[PDB]
């Protein structure tokens, strides 16, 4: 009804009815949003619509104030008053308003339904309130676009990891990634009951769930979304250089367990909010864990953008942090239940943004910052309030699911508010001791993107081979089939069966789908796999398009392996750049 | 009598057949089934006599457990009048997503939640049937 403006933060009672989020607009702001857009519906304590019976006009500049209600020209009384006057729509606080000359950003956010990268660019290069409004508009249009997908009406239940599933005709196929988890709710005899949340992924759909369930007749799974509440808290408060190490309690005993992280902790203790630019596996999973032990005097709160990515966090947290004094609140999908519920007052808290109550802390760490959006940052800052925020990662990771983005992919420095200051003014802190990846990968990434800030771990065995295949591009639904790659797989596996002890990594599971006819292994997606990796890796890119497999996709996807990784450089990008072995067919 | 029992519709008919066997007018133990206001008055007159037999704990709001946001509620989905007999609500939602204002007002005005959330009251100062504190 009444609230602060988006452009001025001034109290107003005008909301754009044609805006999907309906933000509060000042009188001058409402006038600006009305004249320069087709948004002719403006909302108040009463809708600005012609209340005369038998009329259907829903304009604002054509609407006139008649009596106690609103009318158009065709129905206005002789005593009439134009709603659009003095460059401001008639509303509450018509004399206490300042306006703003920056109106094109709001119109671009509202008019454009998030079709290209420039919308996100202008959303990130603005103030906090406009950015939050853009984030919630993006979430609303994301929900609208997600609700326009197919509905899985299960006609038969065949077995596990495979279903006899069919759908309607015309409705499109859900995407490959896990960003489209189904959380539908079916009815059996009288009303709705519990179903559960699962992330169905394409391997007749394979489910990446650790539990079992038997479906029934008439049960359907829908892309259930939520209602985006208004976002109040900003992403981050402005930084300020402290004179001393305050806000965290200095203890006389220091930890010598991580000698190369004491300086990093000292530098974090001087900055309000900080983020360290490191490749995946550069102490990313345990930096905050070692921080919680270096200074066991700060309320450390762990949070992630995915509920299935918390297993990597909990894998070593129980070995490093105590298990008895740590607990997880169970809401009334597979996590530990041996912890103690309703532990409001605890030094270490593990929870998710979906059901995070109001609390306070001193140090908050947000791992996997790439897949979190400005709306996610606002939610994190509103659920948990602290004077310090720590971000682990870098913009050069897997980007957020920009599903509505049709044109070129967004630049890394425009993903979030953190990515803005992470790449424009310069990384606040950097890691120079990366003893996790060998000379090959570390040298490649240092020469490629990481400002030659990474040094060789050990010698390069140079055991990786790349064959020169060409292949043909042919799309059927969303993938491609390459018989020559089937040939090279055998020509590589012929030497020894011991090569197979590896984790199959592929953004698109078409290879697994083809192989399932003879092998049938369950399918898992690499979206949430950081912190756990094997020595050998099986890599099949199978793609060359910049729409998804762009330049900032492989430089961090090759860093997972320790010493053994498939380095098939079928793309004509880095073939004549490194010195590996290659041979022709004898 | 059973404490949970509130209907007594069969008992009222048995009383009517025992004491007014040849009363040549149809008697409705529940006044929901009456024809007009005159029949409502006629059957309520018999219900007045017949309610002096049944326990006073079986009259008042008829409550049942309903769920809102999956959380159980105790609301009156009916009433057992000493004169009007057993009356059941027609728009009763055993489950609901949320209540905006009207159902919230009804359940707030409903003595069901307050009586269920109050301490048992035995007020010996008055002979009136105490409910809860």
């Amino acid at each position: 009804a009444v609230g602060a403006c988006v452009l001025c933060n001034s109290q107003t009672s005008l909301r754009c009815g044609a805006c999907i989020r309906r933000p509060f607009l000042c009188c001058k702001c409402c006038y600006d949003h009305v004249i320069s857009t087709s948004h002719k519906l403006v909302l108040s304590v009463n809708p600005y619509v012609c209340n005369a019976p038998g009329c259907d006009v829903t304009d604002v500049t054509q609407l006139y104030l008649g009596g106690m209600s609103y009318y158009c020209k065709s129905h206005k009384p002789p005593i009439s008053f134009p709603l659009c006057a003095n460059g401001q729509v008639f509303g509450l606080y018509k004399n206490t308003c300042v306006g703003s000359d920056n109106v094109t950003d709001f119109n671009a956010i509202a008019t454009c339904d998030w079709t290209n990268a420039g919308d996100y660019i202008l959303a990130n290069t603005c103030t906090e309130r406009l950015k939050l409004f853009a984030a919630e508009t993006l979430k609303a249009t994301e929900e609208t676009f997600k609700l326009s997908y197919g509905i899985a009406t299960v006609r038969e239940v065949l077995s596990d990891r495979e279903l006899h599933l069919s759908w309607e005709v015309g409705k499109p196929r859900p995407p490959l990634n896990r960003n489209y988890v189904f959380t539908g709710y079916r009815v059996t005899k009288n009303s709705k009951v519990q179903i559960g949340e699962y992330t169905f992924e394409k391997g007749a759909v394979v489910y990446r769930g650790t539990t079992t369930y038997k479906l029934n007749v008439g049960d359907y799974f829908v892309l259930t979304s939520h209602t985006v509440m208004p976002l109040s808290a900003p992403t981050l408060v402005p930084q300020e250089h402290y004179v001393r190490i305050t806000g965290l309690y200095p203890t006389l005993n220091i930890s010598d367990e991580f000698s190369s992280n004491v300086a990093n902790y000292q530098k974090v203790g001087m900055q309000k909010y900080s983020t360290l630019q490191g490749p995946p596996g550069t102490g990313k999973s345990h930096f905050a864990i070692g921080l919680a032990l270096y200074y066991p005097s700060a309320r450390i709160v762990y949070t992630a953008c995915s509920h299935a990515a918390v297993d990597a966090l909990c894998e070593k947290a129980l070995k490093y942090l105590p298990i008895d004094k740590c607990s997880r609140i169970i809401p009334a999908v597979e996590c530990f239940d041996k912890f103690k519920v309703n532990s409001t007052l605890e030094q270490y808290v593990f929870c998710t943004v979906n059901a995070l109550p109001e609390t306070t802390a001193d140090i908050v760490v947000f791992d996997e910052i790439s897949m979190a959006t400005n709306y996610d940052l606002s939610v994190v800052n509103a659920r948990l309030r602290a004077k310090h925020y720590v971000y682990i990662g870098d913009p050069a990771q897997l980007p957020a699911p920009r599903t509505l983005l049709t044109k070129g992919t967004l630049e890394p420095e425009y993903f979030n508010s953190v990515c803005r200051l992470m790449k424009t003014i310069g990384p606040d802190m950097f890691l120079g001791t990366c003893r996790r990846c060998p000379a090959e990968i570390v040298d490649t990434v240092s020469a490629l993107v990481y400002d030659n800030k990474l040094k060789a771990h050990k010698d390069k065995s140079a055991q990786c081979f790349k064959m020169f295949y060409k292949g043909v591009i042919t799309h059927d639904v969303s993938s491609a089939i390459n018989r020559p790659q089937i040939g090279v797989v055998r020509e590589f596996l012929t030497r020894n069966p011991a090569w197979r002890k590896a984790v199959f990594i592929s953004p698109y599971n078409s290879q697994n789908a083809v192989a399932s006819k003879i092998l049938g292994l369950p399918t898992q997606t690499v979206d949430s796999s950081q912190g756990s990796e094997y020595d050998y890796v099986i890599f099949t890119q199978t793609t060359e398009t910049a729409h998804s497999c762009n330049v900032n996709r492989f430089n961090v996807a090759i860093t997972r392996a320790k010493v053994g990784i498939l380095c098939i450089m079928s793309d004509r990008d880095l073939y004549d750049k490194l010195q590996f072995t290659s041979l022709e067919i004898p | 009598w059973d404490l949970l029992k509130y209907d007594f519709t069969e008992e009222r008919l048995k009383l009517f057949d025992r004491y007014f066997k040849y009363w040549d007018q149809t008697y409705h133990p529940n006044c929901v089934n009456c024809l007009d206001d005159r029949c409502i008055l006629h059957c309520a007159n018999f219900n007045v006599l017949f309610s002096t037999v049944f326990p006073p704990t079986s009259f008042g709001p008829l409550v049942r457990k309903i769920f809102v946001d999956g959380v159980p509620f105790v609301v009156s989905t009916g009433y057992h009048f000493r004169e009007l007999g057993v009356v059941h609500n027609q728009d009763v939602n055993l489950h609901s997503s949320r209540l905006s204002f009207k159902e919230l007002l009804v359940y707030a005005a409903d003595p069901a939640m307050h009586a269920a959330s109050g301490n048992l009251l035995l007020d010996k100062r008055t002979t009136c049937f105490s409910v809860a504190a």
Binding site: A1, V2, S13, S44, V45, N46, L65, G67, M68, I79, F81, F90, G91, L92, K94 | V71, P72, F73, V74, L99, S100, F101, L104, L105, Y107, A108, M113, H114, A116, S117
Partner: protein, 49 residues
């Protein structure tokens, strides 16, 4: 006329703004009363054993 129709329009606008303020305050009171009643119901249901 400029001091009779325009002055009347100004009075009508002031009256409409006053009615809008009263309606906004009524909606705020409705929200507060709704929250209070909902919290009362939810805090008395928890004592039901």
């Amino acid at each position: 006329r400029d001091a009779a129709m325009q002055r009347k329009l100004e009075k009508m606008a002031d009256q409409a703004m006053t009615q809008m303020y009263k309606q906004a305050r009524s909606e705020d009171k409705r929200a507060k009363v709704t929250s209070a009643m909902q919290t009362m119901l939810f805090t008395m249901l928890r004592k039901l054993d």
